[PDB]
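Internal ticket #5521
Category: modeling
Description: The requester needs a full-assembly model to guide mutagenesis choices. All entity lines are attached below as received. Residue total reported by intake: 820.
Assigned to: D.W.
Attached entities:
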Amino acid sequence: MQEIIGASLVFLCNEKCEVLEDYGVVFDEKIVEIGDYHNLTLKYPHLKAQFFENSVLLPAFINAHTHFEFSNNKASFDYGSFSGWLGSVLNNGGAILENCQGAIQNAIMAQLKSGVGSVGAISNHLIEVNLLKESPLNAVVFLEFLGSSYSLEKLKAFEAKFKELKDLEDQKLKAALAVHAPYSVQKDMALSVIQLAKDSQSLLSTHFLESLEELEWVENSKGWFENFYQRFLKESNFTSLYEGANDYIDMFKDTHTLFVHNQFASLEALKRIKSQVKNAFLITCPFSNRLLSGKALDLERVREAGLSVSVATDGLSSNISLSLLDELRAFLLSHNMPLLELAKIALLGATRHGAKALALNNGEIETNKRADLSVFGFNEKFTKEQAILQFLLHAKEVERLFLGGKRVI
Amino acid sequence: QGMQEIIGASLVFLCNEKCEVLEDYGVVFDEKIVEIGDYHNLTLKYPHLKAQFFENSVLLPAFINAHTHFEFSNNKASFDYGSFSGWLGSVLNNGGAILENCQGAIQNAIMAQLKSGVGSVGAISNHLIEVNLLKESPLNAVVFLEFLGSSYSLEKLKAFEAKFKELKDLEDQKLKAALAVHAPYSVQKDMALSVIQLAKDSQSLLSTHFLESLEELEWVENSKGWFENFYQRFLKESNFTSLYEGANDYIDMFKDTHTLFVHNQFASLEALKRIKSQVKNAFLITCPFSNRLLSGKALDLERVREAGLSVSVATDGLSSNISLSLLDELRAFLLSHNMPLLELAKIALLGATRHGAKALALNNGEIETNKRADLSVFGFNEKFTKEQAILQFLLHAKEVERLFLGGKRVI
Ligand SMILES: CSC[C@H]1O[C@@H](n2cnc3c2N=CNC[C@H]3O)[C@H](O)[C@@H]1O
Ligand SMILES: CSC[C@H]1O[C@@H](n2cnc3c2N=CNC[C@H]3O)[C@H](O)[C@@H]1O
Ligand SMILES: [Fe+3]
Ligand SMILES: [Fe+3]
């Protein structure tokens, strides 16, 4: 049933990024009504109402791309190059995935305490699914396929794994699918995964042009990936699995597909993604990009292509923190756009845009959306024009978290 | 106990200019570093000295934070960010209110330094309100008494000379008195010359903020931009032209001095080369988070290299930062520059140790015989590879496990 919450500052997280003072929200499981808090308490004098002075009320965050299974990692993988990182992940041989549950639960709570209400979890083995189901998080689990050599047996085992994930779906868990990358998934295997997504009305995700090594491989079949398949996979393949970026992009034509990273995608490739996929969603991971390729996503190019970004943490396999607030501050440091303008992009990248990417009914304070709401408390009240930036700079731990109208924190 | 002891760790960062990394090495030290070598061989050579080895840990010099403003430690959201003019205007409009009831935040700021591995601080001070707490802290302190004043006044000079004498009388083995000229837009030329002369007469170090914003650059070079109305609007002073005709006019005042130049992101290559050739002993200080919050432009490290200079990394104050942990500042530094990460990690580490020690004329910042025994130990859950050790340390180091200052255990 219904209650009223208000704060000195409310971030609607519409595309305008509206900031409202002394506003309130009536909600049960959904957002019922928005308005001035005092007027709301007069209009509904019999409801529970709480006001949080010197606080910010905003939608719970959406973290559209993380790898919970790698939550054990601290220094198991090399940083400073993508090729060095990928080689270290493969040479690790999955050892970091063992004894996983403690780090995954710690990872889940880092999300919730950071204000994250919804997660796009990339999963290769569904080892994190149980803990996610037991958490209050909204979860879209992308079962991610790996395989550079076609095998009908591996397809059937993968479709059997996806059926197990589908049978766990409920109001908090949506099953989805992922193609790992252009260098790691053979074309006909990827086409099969994409077809299964269409047959099951599932979302799609993929890592795209994350490194110069991948760009030189995809475009000219040269560079570091020349020996990658023999050295690491014991596969006799010495040419790219896809002749050019367009060959890969076109597989996702007329789909709802998340494209992650993308820093080495030219303006031609980004425009192709928009025009071919129709419902594409660019995901940016600032800290992961700095640790691996070392190149940040060119946001001006993204704007020139007519696209927008959601900001995600990635996994601890390529990050030091799963707090989305930490990622948003790294995002502010990773781009030289005017900070006040960049703060709005960061906030929308953590709310409305991620919700649209995951096809969730949240990420914005608007009637009929889910009552996924965060309250962050501070020692002062920010000015209207500084509110968003100061929030991103100082927000560390959530003071109140409501998910589906129920108090979680 | 002024006796000697041995400490070793799986990884030791010497922080020489080579940035040497050594495995299973140890250090013998009393108040100074006495001997360096393989830890096991050190325990055989000195079997009666007290000896500890820290597995899966990093031993390195205590950090030097060459530029901070402790007096502004109360600040969280009192000042505007997103532009330098917006920030400076908000600081002035604050009217010093954030400076009142200061001691609680200053003690918290001090302790944030120590737990971050910082052993030495370059503290910029306008009123010496933080000096007392600094003195009874174990930190090595170089307090730069900073002069502000855009209109010449002999009375203001004499009161400033008198405040510096008050600071000089507090000097000891842990406190060095120094002087600072705030900025080209805030200090009248003959007032700055007087401060610089006082530093020479007292053999004091100097520090200054230089070309931190586009607004300052347009003012200094062409007497145009936001600073046109700054003196009437904020200071009630009838001044409409720059206090210095060009950057070289300001730089040349510090000719043949030991002067720290802070920020500098809007200094051209010629200006940086002028600083190097004229000052002779200049030290560039970079504050990545403050630069992002104010002007929004990062220091061009390639330009700094082209000018033949190097940088030390500092936190600035909470007036223009969210954390005074130098480790947080170093991670922000890694995010603020697109240089190859392994190469940038070496610059960051040396920027927090040896370079800052040289800037403050301190006998530390490096694990070398006869240097001060200012040593940090950071513990981890794994042993880093030799080539990843410095970067992984910067990424994962949060709180120090052991801090020794002058050979005495502090943490
Ligand atoms: C062992 S092949 C690559 C594996 O690394 C995993 N991964 C973890 N974090 C990331 C991963 N993949 C690509 N780029 C970095 C980041 O997205 C990915 O799921 C895949 O299982
Ligand atoms: C014209 S008043 C400026 C005052 O702000 C203080 N300040 C605090 N942090 C910084 C300050 N000065 C210049 N740029 C930003 C940073 O260095 C400075 O010491 C001075 O007292
Ligand atoms: Fe990923
Ligand atoms: Fe400063």
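Resolution: model delivered.
Comment from assignee: The interface with chain A takes residues 76-78, 80-82, 288-289, 292-293, 296-298, 322, 331-332, 334-336, 338, 340-342, 345, 380-382, 384-385, 388, 391-392, 395-396 of chain B (CB under 8 Å).
Ticket closed.
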